[model samples]
Target chain A: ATKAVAVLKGDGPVQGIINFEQKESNGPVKVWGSIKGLTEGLRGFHVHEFGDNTAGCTSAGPHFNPLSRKHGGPKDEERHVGDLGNVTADKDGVADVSIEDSVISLSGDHSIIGRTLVVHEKADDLGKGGNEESTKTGNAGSRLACGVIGIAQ
Target chain B: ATKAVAVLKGDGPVQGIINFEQKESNGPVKVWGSIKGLTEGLRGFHVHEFGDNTAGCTSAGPHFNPLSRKHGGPKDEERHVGDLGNVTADKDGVADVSIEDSVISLSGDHSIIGRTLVVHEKADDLGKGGNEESTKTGNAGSRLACGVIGIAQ
Candidate 1:
């Protein structure tokens, strides 16, 4: 019950500020943050379901699959608990990604807390292959930017 | 037939970089960029249609409407040509997004030239006032980061 996540930083193309803390894990559900001015290489971060920002961010739909699974790669068997994997951007893009989601349930209501934080363009083939029903979410393409996941007022 | 646009950059929670370009437009077919570490205020960028890197950016499938019309903004009145609008960020989270889609066709094949760039968390009412329909997109709620919009090998 200790929360203090108020990271906001977005402007040119993108900037950083991702401070998520939700400890008390049994195994999966421990988020951390600290990113800055990324833009170097390998960028694909996730955790989205819905928050609906409309006009932009495509209303924040898909990805929170509920259970409709198919996306693949978090461990894959058929992934989509909001799949939280991949986040590598070095050479200047910067990256310090940490993920662990057994089914991402911070508390009761199957809490993602208030999901939404996607960033990709490439790199996430983690499923190894590609196009096998979507590879969990590692096909990693498009949606180059997005943000949301509030609680730090 | 002149294309060479690259701007990759990202890190964790919310970073920046993913400017893209592809010329040859009579109108509507503009793919602009700019979102430098935002958080000063106003945020909500788009241009999502479908590319599916693997669900990284949610497989890029919603936004670029193509006139099915529903969500409005880019000028409204039958929106969804991938309605482009918003993107304010200042105080320190810079944002200088640009757009101009008559129908969005970079060259041949109505090319979005590989799209994907979403960044939201709030801001993008634009509908004038009150929920005319605003299901999500303009809700600009979550999804505080994303990237993808390349063309520069």
Candidate 2:
């Protein structure tokens, strides 16, 4: 099985802590981390395309959708390749999230090697189901925080 | 003490494991939990607002900002009330996050009840010091994944 490593670095007020592990099979990725000096609540989260940290998280661009699919749920038939899903936090603003996906490839043209991680200021809404925008980007609004998935080796 | 709970009702291909705990002494609210079920790498994370549960985590609205402040780091004096920092996933995608904030309240109008949690594709650039755009939102981007925070009681 292959192995990859990611490092998360944020600013002062928006401190960060990240932990992840790749699976040997076509299973989901396991992750853990925390953000210090934050409000006592939840924050948005996601994986984006690119690794240009020059402009912070914005430089990371949209989700890593090499297929250019609609922004639906990770299990949807027409979702982006980087659509890993969501997480939750405690009353103290700290969140511990775990998830798995088949779209995340470590090797290949659509690999997530140089992609980035992001946190938002709002929830994603998952497309609204029956609405016109249902198959779109899920309506998850505004980018709040961000980071890059760097290879430890 | 007041207690709140956040849940992600299965909307993506990846499963999630979460954990949280309260900070030192942040006003009236105390948070707690753990981060689990993530990829073997670093992923960005944060809390947000709204709770719709649409297609791709779009149901959740923007970060819980009852005060309507600028998007600065959590430690910034002019930052929003919902600016909880970023969380990190380890090489195993497992992060154990915990913290405290004096400005957050569990009840009243400033409470973070009914908000959302999110994982990102990149890291948040705390800002280049004097850049206005960068300082507004920490330069985080994209909605890779998301979840909601509910009442634990």
Candidate 3:
């Protein structure tokens, strides 16, 4: 109940580990991890619906939206469950991310365990890019890296 | 709600994929997969407690045992949630595994998602090896390969 992790890997040098922690069943979840070999900018981050990496990250499906909600920032009430916004990479192309969220869970109906955590090639527009893709994906570019969320001790 | 998968990898040429399927929330899970580069014999298979591969399969921790039970075969009631027994490899060093398990789950409290599925270097004794190690690990040898269980469409 306290921890889970995803080990991200892609065709290029993009890879890292992301951890999720939930203190209680219905409490906020804490996220912390470091991704290396990025491109020194904000990258769109999300939990895709599936964990299938058979065809690379392309087969992991779309943002998890069990509620049939529209795409939005992590802070938006109308956002998809997979929406975690973005992570900024430094000059060294490493993204050290830390986020605390209320919607993401490790248990219950909305549990994200077994899902795919993906890092996009570009920055997320937070559903404000004023385009059709923005309303669905924040206009985040192709998947740069991805891994499945797994239970951790 | 019906599918999940794990992509197994190891130091050597061992690699494969395992898929889990459940038709209902509390129904039996159907397991199927194929692993190559094995040693043409029975290999211990179980779900470890963590999804970590930081140090290969060694960091995956012990067999998943949330119920605090002793080690046993896949059909034993006293077995751990991870105790799937073993998989036999063919003369060509390939293991084609298929199992229908009622204990393993994809959702709720006993979900195996976000955990590590490990294949051992030797066969599991299924807790009847008549030794202390049998009660703990079925005397399964060192881990040969592992992968994290991820959600799939």
The prediction achieving the highest lDDT against the true structure is 3
DockQ class, candidate 1: incorrect
Cα lDDT tens digits, model 2, B24-53, are 323534444455555545444555654333
lDDT of 3 by residue, B11-126 (tens): 98888899999999989999999999999999999999887776788988999888788999999979999899999999999999999998889877677888889999999999
lDDT of 1 by residue, B48-151 (tens): 66422232455455676654566667766655655566778787777766665565454443444334556767776754546754633776655566544433
Scoring the B chain of model 3 against the true B chain gives a TM-score of 0.97
- Which runs in model 3 stand beyond 4 Å of their true positions? none
What fraction of native interface contacts does model 3 preserve?
A: 0.76
> Tens digits of per-residue lDDT for model 3 on A1-153?
578888889999999999899989868999999999999999999999987876789888999899999999999998999999999999999999999999989887788887889999999999999778998999899999998787777
Q: Model 3: how far is B50 from its true place, Å?
A: 1.9
lDDT of each: 0.54, 0.52, 0.89
In model 2, what is the error at residue B110, expressed in angstroms?
Answer: 52
Off by over 4 Å in 2: A9-12, A25-27, A36-42, A129-136, B1-153
Docking class of 3: medium
TM-score of 2: 0.44
Residue B12 alpha-carbon offset, candidate 2, angstroms: 41
